[PDB]
Amino acid sequence: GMARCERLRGAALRDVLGQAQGVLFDCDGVLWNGERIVPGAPELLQRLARAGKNTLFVSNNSRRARPELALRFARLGFAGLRAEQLFSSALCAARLLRQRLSGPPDASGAVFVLGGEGLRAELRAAGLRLAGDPGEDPRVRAVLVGYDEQFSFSRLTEACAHLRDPDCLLVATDRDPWHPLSDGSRTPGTGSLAAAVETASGRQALVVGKPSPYMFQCITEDFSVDPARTLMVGDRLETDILFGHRCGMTTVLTLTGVSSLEEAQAYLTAGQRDLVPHYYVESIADLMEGLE
Amino acid sequence: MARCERLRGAALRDVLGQAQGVLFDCDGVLWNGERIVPGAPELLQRLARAGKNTLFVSNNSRRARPELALRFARLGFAGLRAEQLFSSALCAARLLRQRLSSGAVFVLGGEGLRAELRAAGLRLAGDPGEDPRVRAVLVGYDEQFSFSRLTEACAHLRDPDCLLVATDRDPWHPLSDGSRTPGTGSLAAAVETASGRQALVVGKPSPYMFQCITEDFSVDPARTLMVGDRLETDILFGHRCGMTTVLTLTGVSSLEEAQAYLTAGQRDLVPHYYVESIADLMEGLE
Ligand SMILES: O=c1cc(-c2ccccc2)oc2c(O)c(O)ccc12
Ligand SMILES: [Mg+2]
Ligand SMILES: [Mg+2]
């Protein structure tokens, strides 16, 4: 029913987890912040696994391709996870591009990427050719906007030149407007760079990352997931919680990240139903009281 | 000193009653090819209903954990968890991740072995795009083994910092028709000889396979029954880990080979107990 931003504890926690077949975790602000894990996060994943609960992971962070992201999980103390459980915006972008650019061998094209090496590596793993890689650059058939620490006026100009070709696709990893750093400062997100590309090119980007439903499609392509039996746990109302509502999942806001309980309750008072979490917890460690 | 005694009657009830769990080898114990050992699914059921933990080891490096879990279910073993399955492929992937904590791994092996390494976050030589420095060579069961591939492996091993790992040293494996196929131990011997290197072996009887289990589960070896069909791998493994060993006769090794080891004083290759098949163990449960 309508979300009420209720604190998940006691019987409500036991019932919700007991009926759930799996949990879908956002990563940044949920499992960790920078190099600091959320206390109790590794133990939660273990007890979820021993309870027969499936776990999957989403993230709009495109800094690490799947191999390095799996190494990060293991290094930070999350054991027993498999790389195929990890669904970043980089992975989903590579899938979409592969799906859309699959065709005659003589007509494969190249992807112009505004983003970092991890994003480039994820596209290469999918078989995509990248503009700027060694050797002649084939016809650019798509522009991909991601988190780009090297964003520049000249490369923005170059992306838009490619987009003058109406057959050149425009894809964005996500629309996150900004991201918090350890020192309290903020960094602009793909949403800010996408707004620049979209405005200068007059185009609408295809967005793969949450809250876009495509990110869930990527999961369902690999795993049988009953959304009505899946908990969506995230820290950002405008991405994770909206994502859950669009996919029909029960949404849980954790307060270890971007969004606050006051922001959530403000959405409820305004009747903005799809941005109101069904439940909330101080941290995902609070969920362990519903197991054993 | 083990005496390879037929486990039956009261001894069977005492042994199973005191055990917290059973560690099963897979090939030759639970099945042979696509033909399950009669009564094997029922045994696992009754073990579960008795509160007995069950774990599974295998030097078979052909199947990644998901496909191995599917195999169990397809053959009639229900209610098992992928976290209970410890193949040499899985343990090899874990060792390489630790040692390389990354570079890329040149794999002499099949898709299941490659998939297991990819699932652990390791990059593989020959995969699309990234061309990292090869920091390890992994030898597994490789039906594509060739002179050219052996030559490539040795070229990487000219770098003294490139690790050499082998999934196991099983010399050969039996097929349904009575024929045999060369095992990883034969291919590792070629790689080791041509490179002048000694390989790190993860699979039983190497103790690392047990380290992989104990990292995931609290296992008291003194209360665990190691059930296998191969004296030189399963039984030796059990002795090295301090487990009570049970030889089943549905697989590679014979009771005469076991009694030959007892006559020669090779304690670590003599099973503590033996059964014609693991179905005989069901009589100690109720
Ligand atoms: O997509 C990215 C998201 C983030 C991020 C930073 C702080 C909090 C949450 C997410 O950082 C990145 C980064 O540092 C890179 O080098 C490349 C990509 C990303
Ligand atoms: Mg987040
Ligand atoms: Mg065997």
Three-class HEC string of A201-236: HCCCCEECCCCCCHHHHHHHHHCCCCHHHEEEEECC
* B66 is a domain residue: no
Q: Which residues of A touch B213 (CB under 8 A)?
A: none
Interatomic CA distance for residues A253 and A283, integer angstroms: 9
Q: Which ligand is nearest to the CA of A174?
A: 1
Annotation says A167 is catalytic: no
Our CA-based measurement puts residue A140 at a distance from the nearest CA of chain B, in whole angstroms, of: 18
Pair B192, B253 in one domain: no
Residues of B with Cβ-Cβ distance to A119 under 8 angstroms = none
Cβ contacts of B186-191, under 8 Å, gap ≥ 24: B187/B108, B187/B139, B187/B141, B187/B142, B187/B145, B188/B139, B190/B150, B191/B108, B191/B137, B191/B139, B191/B150, B191/B153, B191/B154, B191/B157, B191/B164, B191/B166
Please give the residue range of the domain that contains residue B107. Answer: 89-201
**Residue located nearest, by CA, to atom 3 of ligand 1:** A61
Q: Which of A179, A181, A186, A259 to mutate to test the pocket of ligand 1 (most atoms within 8 A of CB)?
A: A179
Distance A94 CA to ligand 2 centre (A): 21
Are B252 and B181 within one domain?
A: no
Query: Is A82 in Cβ contact with B119 (below 8 Å)?
Result: yes
> What element of type H or E holds B6?
strand B5-6
Q: Are residues B222 and B191 in the same domain?
A: no
Same domain, yes or no, for B164 and B226?
A: no
- A54 is known to lie in a ligand binding site: no
Contact partners, residue B123, CB within 8 Å, separation at least 6: A67, B102, B103, B104, B105, B130, B132
- Rounded to a whole number of angstroms, the distance from the CA of A266 to the nearest CA of chain B is 41
Residue A49 with chain B: CB contacts under 8 Å = 83
A105 and A198 in one domain?
Answer: yes
C-alpha span between B194 and B286 (Å, rounded): 55
Contact B121 A83 (CB under 8 A): yes
Determine the residue type at A283.
S
Q: Are residues A179 and A248 located together in one domain of the fold?
A: no
- Chain A residues within an 8 Å CB radius of B127: 125
Same domain, B193 and B215: no
3-state secondary structure of B264: coil
- Selection from B146, B148, B135 nearest residue B187 by Cα: B146
Residue B255 shares a structural domain with residue B154: no
Q: How far is the CA of B276 from the centre of ligand 3 (A)?
A: 14
Q: Which residues fall within 8 angstroms of residue B274, CB to CB, at 6 or more apart?
A: B4, B5, B6, B7, B246, B247, B248, B249, B255, B258
User: Distance, in angstroms, between B131 CA and closest chain A CA?
Assistant: 10
Residue B144 counted as domain residue: yes
In a domain, A84, yes or no: no
Take atom 16 of ligand 1 and give the residue whose Cα is closest: A63
A212 among annotated binding-site residues:
no
On whether both A218 and A283 belong to a single domain, the answer is yes
- Radius of gyration for the alpha carbons in chain B, expressed in angstroms and rounded: 19
**Residue B77 falls inside a structural domain:** no
The residues facing A186 across adjacent strands are A180
Is B177 annotated as a binding-site member?
no
Within this chain, do residues B127 and B165 fall inside the same structural domain, yes or no? yes
| Helices B208-216, B88-99: inter-axial angle, 10-degree rounding | 90
Interchain pair A70, B123: CB under 8 A: no
In a domain, residue B181? The reply is yes
* Domain-located, residue B74: no
Q: Which of B175, B201, B227 is the last residue of a domain?
A: B201
CATH number at residue B219: 3.40.50.1000
- Alpha carbon of B83: minimum distance to chain A alpha carbons (Å): 8
Cα distances from A291 to residues A284, B15, B215, in angstroms, run 13, 33, 22
Residues within a 6 A CB radius of ligand 1? A 28, 61-63, 116, 147, 149, 179-181, 187
Closest B-chain CA to A83: B119
> Which residues on chain B place their C-beta less than 8 Å from a C-beta of chain A?
65, 81, 83, 97, 101-102, 118-123, 127-130, 215-216
Domain end call among A207, A240, A265: A207
Q: Which atom of ligand 1 is nearest to the CA of A28?
A: 9
A248 in a domain, yes or no?
yes
Q: Which of B65, B81, B100, B118 to mutate to test the interface with A (most CBs of A within 10 A)?
A: B118
> What DSSP assignment string belongs to chain A?
-----EE--HHHHHHHHHH-SEEEEE-BTTTEETTEEPTTHHHHHHHHHHTT-EEEEEE---SS-HHHHHHHHHHTT--S--GGGEEEHHHHHHHHHHHHH-S-TTS--EEEEES-HHHHHHHHHTT--BTTSSSPPPPEEEEEE---TT--HHHHHHHHHHHTSTTSEEEES----EEE-TTS-EEE-HHHHHHHHHHHHT---EE-STTSTHHHHHHHHHS---GGGEEEEES-IIIIIHHHHHHTPEEEEESSSS--HHHHHHHHHTT-GGGS-SEEESSGGGGGGG--
Same domain, residue pair B215 and B268: yes
Q: How many folded domains does chain A comprise?
A: 2
Other C-beta atoms lying within 10 Å of the C-beta of residue A183: 7
Q: Find chain B residues with C-beta within 8 A of A57's C-beta.
A: none
Of the residues B123, B124, B216, B217, the best mutation for testing chain A's interface (the one with the most A CB atoms within 10 Å of its CB) is: B123
Q: Which residues of B are tagged catalytic?
A: 25, 27
State the Cα torsion B265-B266-B267-B272 to the nearest 10°: -100
The reply to whether B182 and B125 lie within a common domain is yes
Is residue A66 included in any domain, yes or no?
Answer: no
Breaks (C-N over 2.5 A) in chain B follow: 101
**Which residue from B64, B12, B69 is spatially nearest to B43, judged by alpha carbons?**
B12
Asked if residues B24 and B227 have their Cβ atoms less than 8 Å apart, the reply is yes
Q: Is B58 annotated as a binding residue?
A: yes
* Dist. CA A90 → ligand 1 center (Å): 11
Q: Which of B201, B223, B255 is the last residue of a domain?
A: B201
Is B156 labeled as ligand-binding?
A: no
Dist. CA B229 → ligand 3 center (Å): 5
Residue A66: closest C-alpha in chain B: B121
Q: Among residues B16, B43, B17, B15, which one has the least CA distance to residue B29?
A: B43
Return all residues near B261 (Cβ < 8 A) that are at least 6 apart: B231, B269, B270
